[model samples]
Target chain A: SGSFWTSTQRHHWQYTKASLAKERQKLWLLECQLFPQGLNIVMDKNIPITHRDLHYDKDYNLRIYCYFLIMKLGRRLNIRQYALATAHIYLSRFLIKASVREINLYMLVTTCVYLACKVEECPQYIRTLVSEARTLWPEFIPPDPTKVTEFEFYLLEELESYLIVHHPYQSLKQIVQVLKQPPFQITLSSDDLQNCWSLINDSYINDVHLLYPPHIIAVACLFITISIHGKPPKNSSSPVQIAFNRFMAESLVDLEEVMDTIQEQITLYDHWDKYHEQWIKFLLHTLYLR
Target chain B: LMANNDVFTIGPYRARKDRMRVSVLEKYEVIGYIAAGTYGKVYKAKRQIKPLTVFYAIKKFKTEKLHYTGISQSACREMALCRELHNKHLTTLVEIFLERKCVHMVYEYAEHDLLQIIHFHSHPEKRMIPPRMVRSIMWQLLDGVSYLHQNWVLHRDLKPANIMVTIDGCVKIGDLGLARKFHNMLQTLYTGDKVVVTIWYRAPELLLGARHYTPAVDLWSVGCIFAELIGLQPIFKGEEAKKKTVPFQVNQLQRILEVLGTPDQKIWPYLEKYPEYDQITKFPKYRDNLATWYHSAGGRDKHALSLLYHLLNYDPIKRIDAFNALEHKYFTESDIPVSENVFEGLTYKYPARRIHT
Candidate 1:
């Protein structure tokens, strides 16, 4: 298994489709472990938590979570993907803030996604979304017209009536390209590329979409990727070149606080094990066999 | 009262429990319960360091706990309107102090209410208010009502019970618990409760279940008050108590026609469009029922009765409005002093009136 694209690190691009899928699935499993139901990140179990603790038994919650995480990751890849990702972001945020008891999470998800897409200037057809929701949750479809209209109103309200999203997909692409050459190029390995992709993928599961500036999260994504790969070996490439590329990318964003905040969130994830152990193990088990 | 010059910001006030302990009484102390309703309770209390031990009425409500009334808009409109409005006839919103989940409104206290006075004097034998006093009170009432209507505001709930009278005989409108502010000229309220006004003061349009009405509804109540003033009883108080709930579409039209003559469709083109106007029953004696009954059985001032009849006209659009009623000959005829003195020294008599130390 190797990098999905070819370059100096092109030798690793020899993996089969099945191998690539398996590798991505394995990575997703690990990511799920980081946010599992019974794992305690902090020392106190009483502290309020999101994600893992909120209705983990329901499959709909799991689907919504996966959808949101993918959108968050896609946002860092390209503008079109970023637009789609933001729609998912808005949908997830609304569902989280508004209880799912009153509304079917499936329909609510579709509505949020539709509204988000519209806001991000990549709108999907309303009828398509409504039909998709009806198809997905046929067992407990909401009959009230008011509830359907109310959800639309709530989506706008929660987003502060603003829907335009700024994704850092271009920045990530530029930084990745810049990091591939010169003194920095030697230090990069196939795993470093994969780690970057996985980090962007996991960033969606948290409020990184809701809180941090996209470019800052991009920086954090780069930093965390570098940390996961550890310091490059001496003979491979000089770390100084990597430092220059990071500096240039950081200069472009000027979202220093966002970078620091996401770094803090990364640190928080390190300590989330105790809070999330059981559910993380279960999600991983589910992913391993798949 | 909080300093008028001070600016208040609405952040950092998050926790409900933390809010309840921070009392807004820099100069006032809330005492016992005065009234209770769907939202919360109103209390009668006095300020500590006034020239006299002045009493103030404070209404306390919980924002989290509403009686499924969809009162959120009403709450917003009332606060927004009260904060911007300052008039002697309109009830003053002394301050809105929030202690966490609870919101407290401080208002100038009044003694017995106008409704109580009217109810006491409804009997012909015992009339406390003379026609001169009625003209004076009605004039002040119109002054406040016009001010509200001019500002695109509506007091959805209007009746004598909500009209408070101070010890100095000042009739100040109070209990704006159901007031609303409309940005558009054609704004309509889908209020739930039907029994908004007292039976005698209920507008004919409202009685016949009209939803989208104008400020002229308040004028109908004013007309009822005018009749009560002269006859010492509600002019439209039906003898059959069962008919009280059933609206008077035809009967009200007949009453008005008898006094003011039949209204042509050209005068009120929208009369037929009224939700219940088509249901009215017409007969030979229909026009004579209201006016003839009043003049023959009860010997009262016919012109005054005629004016009241115009005020309570079945067609809301045709009824006399506040501005036109203020210009009526009855007001011009009375030597009623049309000055700011109508509300002079009204709020000054409160006990324990606070002054800055």
Candidate 2:
């Protein structure tokens, strides 16, 4: 059961980037088809938005809003960091099948964090959670616990109860351990792994988890931190990339899997940085105005 | 007209419409109410999806006045763990859906359970659960608990009522409401839920206030259950602590002491580690009388007593593990193979389960 290959996250939840794009765009299509008349596509100063603007990048805008909301709630409640990732994935998994317009979004975020703490075995009293969430988004949520627990019931079924997540943290440690072992014999400082772990933290901001395996993300982060600075600065004699690549080569590893993840990870960071006020305006009402 | 229209758009109509999009819970028709407990009532229902062998026992968790309370952590953990586990020894969670903020989890119906079997046999006849029957039951129960232990799920509440039996003779462990899949102690297991399992089948480590316990806590309950099956009565019948200012630990320890000898440092080296060890006092000196007690309770085999005594070992470390207990002499040395159908030899038409209309 501990095997990641047998895990529900690996088998049932992982999706190709192309398929995930279709999954995301399906929500836009559904919102447009069912509730097209419900939304006003015009901007504040009369800049009219079109289907193209809404269709592309609309998913990230709403998802980024969720990521920060989860971040704020998680910080206030003082739940573990990895558990926040579980809740993040819960929202991601929920949106994969259901449109954002279908349910109460704020309550869904509260419920996602609430359930993840339980799933992760971090026991925060439910009333404390509801109270904390209400403090942050008073307009959006009620003080009542059922507002959270009620949505939790539906989210449970929506997720098919695949709660145990395979975070990139473990894979990062495994790769670090492998690098320290025989034939590889490369020692990584604690700082290197900690920095790599920070990159793993940001990996949850997008669907990089869905597109690639955790180890691929782990190695890709290592690729950036360990040797990318050594890039155009490598020596056949004694550079980090040579040893890291040699480790990859002897193991029948492809350059593309880890290289492709590095691209996606940076792309996630770029999109995550672009999140601002106008993006929130688009996320809050534009796409979800059912 | 406005009031009626407004209610339709925002109230049950919206919820019902959402429910309809996915499979609806209304598909399952409630035939009879089964029983009620701390969580809520369970009902006998038929999944009208023309379901496979359609009888279902729908467990509807309590919908508290949400103005005050949230969903029980116990209920949420049950729903969560039930999502993944699968074994013949464990009950199949048919499907779970929600309505009225109450979790209605559907499980395949069981016609008989160990408590009912004990109840039936304990009446006027005092006809004991046959040795052959208890042996097989023990094996299957161990098999089930072994599966859960292997999966990191501890079915902490293992009792007669929670152990279900199908008409086909398979033992299905039900009600994982108290179960938890633990790896690292969340700064000691008892820190979160101070109380676990039932008072009667409660493990000795819990009573001793051991900060760190293992799956052996479950093994001890299984031991209590194994003894109960043979005697048709709870082996450790003691008064549960009702209110404050009373530690009520003495009575249960007294019952256990009467059967198994009192524990000392020699018996359990880590006895001092239990926070309540110093307070576990005031019992008159008692000797291990388990063999004599089991004999009178219809224990004929030396191996049966060995298995039971080892399972109920005072030290949690020494208690029989689920996997190792399966290979006990009581099971391996038996002439009769453990039955898939426990009632293979005994032809008693124990009454069907009660269904309150």
* Model 1, span B233-287: residue lDDT tens: 5566533233445445445444444444554476567767766665553533333
> Candidate 1, residue A158: CA error in Å?
18
Instruction: Report the C-alpha lDDT of model 2 over A1-290, residue by residue, as the tens digit.
Output: 24566555667678887888787787557555554434445555554544534543335766766777789888888777877888898888877777655566777888888788877777777778877866776555655565466566667767876777766777777777777776778876678667777777777866677777777777778777777445434256455667887877778656677777887777877876676757565546554342
Q: What lDDT would each prediction earn against the true structure?
A: 0.53, 0.72
TM-score of chain A of each: 0.52, 0.85
Per-residue lDDT tens digits for candidate 2, residues B1-357, read: 111111111122245347455333456787887775655878888767533664678887765624424567787778777867777888898777766456677888887888888888867978867778888888888888888888676777877887888777899988787877675333356667777777889878777766566778888888888888777778898777644333747788888887787888888888887665666777877887777777787747678877877888877667778788888787667678887788897877789888887
Q: Which 10 residues in a row give candidate 2 chain A its minimum summed lDDT?
A: A49-58
lDDT for A230 in candidate 2 is: 53
The DockQ scores of all candidates, in the order shown, are 0.01, 0.33
lDDT of 1 by residue, A126-145 (tens): 55544444544343234333
RMSD each, Å: 20.5, 4.5
